[PDB]
Subunit: 198 residues, 4 copies
Amino acid sequence: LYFQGMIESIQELLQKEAQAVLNIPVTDAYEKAVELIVEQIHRKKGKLVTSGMGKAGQIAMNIATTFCSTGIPSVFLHPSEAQHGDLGILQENDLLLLISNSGKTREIVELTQLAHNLNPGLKFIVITGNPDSPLASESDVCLSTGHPAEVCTLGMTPTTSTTVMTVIGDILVVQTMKRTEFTIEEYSKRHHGGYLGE
Amino acid sequence: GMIESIQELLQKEAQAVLNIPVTDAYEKAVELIVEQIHRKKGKLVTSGMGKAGQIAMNIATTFCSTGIPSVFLHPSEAQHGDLGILQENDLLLLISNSGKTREIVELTQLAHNLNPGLKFIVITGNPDSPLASESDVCLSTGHPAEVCTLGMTPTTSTTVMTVIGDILVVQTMKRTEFTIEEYSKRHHGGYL
Amino acid sequence: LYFQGMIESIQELLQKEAQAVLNIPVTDAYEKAVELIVEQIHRKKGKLVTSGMGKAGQIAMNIATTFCSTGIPSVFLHPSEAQHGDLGILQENDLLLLISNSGKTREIVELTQLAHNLNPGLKFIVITGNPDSPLASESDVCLSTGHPAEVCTLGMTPTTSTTVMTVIGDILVVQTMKRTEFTIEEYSKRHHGGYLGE
Amino acid sequence: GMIESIQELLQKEAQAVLNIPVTDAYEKAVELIVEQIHRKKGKLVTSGMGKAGQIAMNIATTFCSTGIPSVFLHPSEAQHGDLGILQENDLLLLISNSGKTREIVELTQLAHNLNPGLKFIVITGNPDSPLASESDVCLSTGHPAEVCTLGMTPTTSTTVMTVIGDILVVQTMKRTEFTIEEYSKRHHGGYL
Ligand SMILES: Nc1ccn([C@@H]2O[C@H](COP(=O)(O)O[C@@]3(C(=O)O)C[C@@H](O)[C@@H](O)[C@@H]([C@H](O)CO)O3)[C@@H](O)[C@H]2O)c(=O)n1
Ligand SMILES: Nc1ccn([C@@H]2O[C@H](COP(=O)(O)O[C@@]3(C(=O)O)C[C@@H](O)[C@@H](O)[C@@H]([C@H](O)CO)O3)[C@@H](O)[C@H]2O)c(=O)n1
Ligand SMILES: Nc1ccn([C@@H]2O[C@H](COP(=O)(O)O[C@@]3(C(=O)O)C[C@@H](O)[C@@H](O)[C@@H]([C@H](O)CO)O3)[C@@H](O)[C@H]2O)c(=O)n1
Ligand SMILES: Nc1ccn([C@@H]2O[C@H](COP(=O)(O)O[C@@]3(C(=O)O)C[C@@H](O)[C@@H](O)[C@@H]([C@H](O)CO)O3)[C@@H](O)[C@H]2O)c(=O)n1
């Protein structure tokens, strides 16, 4: 007896997604992560290596690009592909940013072990839905999503979790760029001229 | 303090999401996806450049995950042969914040020459743009201010884009009545 | 007492790579593979789904592009990513082309199992250095590389093996395009105008 | 018969590989790689479009595998922020069959504005082209005929390009004295 129009259904989705974003835990973990990024990339001239699987990995891809776009060299390392030679992308002073909703993604656990064997000094920041997970407990810094309910009709498909992860990405980029004092001239050098209205 | 600054960021991002304009365009977009992919057995081809393109990637994956075959077609690469990915009954989902991204304009022209019946949905910050005007359905981001210190870096725009993606997937999976059984067949056993 | 200049060293590498190509086994397996591609894609209107890991995977990527460029719709499905939802790219009448030098690549074995559970009618062509492997024996068609020695100084890095793989890719494309009678007009529609001198 | 036709294709592809012109340009390219990456600790940024770009992808992986950090930078995506991947001491390896690929020409100009000291090696079928003449080192494919039925599709050209990649990797790993221990560290345990 209770028809709901598509518009109203979508407005509720907006409220749920917006609420998930408002609920992102904000602790001194952010300051610690931003300090690591500034120290390792901006000062020591390493690069930020991001990784994840599935939709979470695609957010990691987007975070690497946003950092490149804001003067923090960054590359996505596919965690399966790492095991077939791509691990050799790693250089001295690099920093890892890993995304794992579960905190126990097989390829990410495997990547951390292999990366540590190659360079035990490498640090990692983890973005996860589960701060009690192995990856979270082993991380140098753990950023939690707050573990919002997915808006998937089955409660399963990454939706609100991935929206939260992209915001955590934005936060890291914006706080870092404030510290590095990234300029509009440096922005222009990393983009085609249309970005400056030329 | 950094904590207060991040809280302000969260307010701005959440407000951008709350501000996404909701019209009958969503139902029209969902009906096209249901018709072309669910009924006619085409696939959803997504595209974009830069960070917006990476959102387009994530949307394709989300659709595959929920029973709507979907692939990302790089709009520059399309012009070097990858356009041949296109099959009868496919549907394009194009993401362009400006609504005039060079490679997306080029993609639309080449795709139209290949198959003039192909339709497209565009997600854009500028519904008055060429791409928007030519689209079969236009979904606006509401063009929120970026939270970038320079006002330039895609941040709130790409967060909105990912949410629009989520919306399309959720409303589609309602219509197609996608089941947990079919979810489980598209994922490793840990997902059950 | 026996210095070898770089030019002479490189000439030897060319001889070795060229010989690997000459040595590619040519049997009726090619006709069977081409028949499957023509049947599934050209007649039944499925698409060709390629996959591999590491450098072999990048050859799989290149084959998908070459097929698209010649009128055989094709996409690369990353075999790890398949397990996180991307398996849903698969449609009725699709055909798999898998590349595994060892013929036991973890993610490829996992992919075939998962794909078979989704659609047991799906067939696969495997390109491999080991025709006695599990993937080779399970395949509908097995195309062997001949297993050339790598030109790597350690004998390990994929070099001659991936050169052969890309050639096997070229063979499948050329023989299929003969059968489909792909035209210059159809080529033109899948490329920018510079490709036609326009 | 198909067997005879395939045998002919093998001959053509093998001959293309044998015909790769070998000059001091290889030593010059390997010295740049060893200097910029091995000595100065930069990374090798590869790029290309279309199938040639997928060869550039495979070269980056092969260098990583052999102790030369390397990453593929998509030349269109570079113009949307990804150019910021570039670090001091990096070296570019560009693949353009025509030697005038729009995105690669655009990439060189943007890269040069970012860091005028950046050098580039170009692999091309046309050593008289703009990209070729402005490169620090030009490695030519010998522009073999394609085995495509139309003479169009990159086949022999891309086979030559992958071999040129193998050459650079092998000659570089000789100079760097890369060891099995270091190989094993960049691969899963099955590789040992
Ligand atoms: N050792 C493991 C690893 C994972 N899982 C389960 O497998 C599912 C998928 O988790 P994942 O393999 O770590 O993969 C990711 C992840 O990062 O968690 C990928 C990401 O893109 C997204 O698809 C999320 C989902 O949001 C589910 O967590 O899943 C989860 O329910 C997880 O609890 C498990 O039971 N045991
Ligand atoms: N014919 C064009 C095309 C673009 N532009 C300008 O170039 C800039 C970049 O727009 P784009 O090339 O279309 O690229 C995208 C886009 O989709 O709009 C890519 C996307 O990932 C993201 O980086 C957005 C930015 O959010 C800015 O729009 O930019 C914008 O300021 C746009 O107005 C322009 O002036 N003229
Ligand atoms: N169950 C398995 C799987 C693999 N291996 C070993 O692991 C190594 C890597 O093989 P792979 O993981 O299957 O990966 C690939 C492969 O497809 O074989 C990827 C490809 O890009 C290329 O790097 C090749 C190498 O050429 C070695 O085969 O390796 C090989 O020595 C193989 O014999 C193994 O011992 N047991
Ligand atoms: N300013 C330009 C640029 C390109 N072209 C022409 O456009 C075609 C495609 O060349 P490209 O855009 O540079 O693209 C590549 C290239 O790198 O040359 C990509 C590569 O993967 C492969 O598809 C090759 C072909 O092998 C043809 O060169 O093409 C060629 O015929 C070239 O001569 C042109 O006429 N004018």
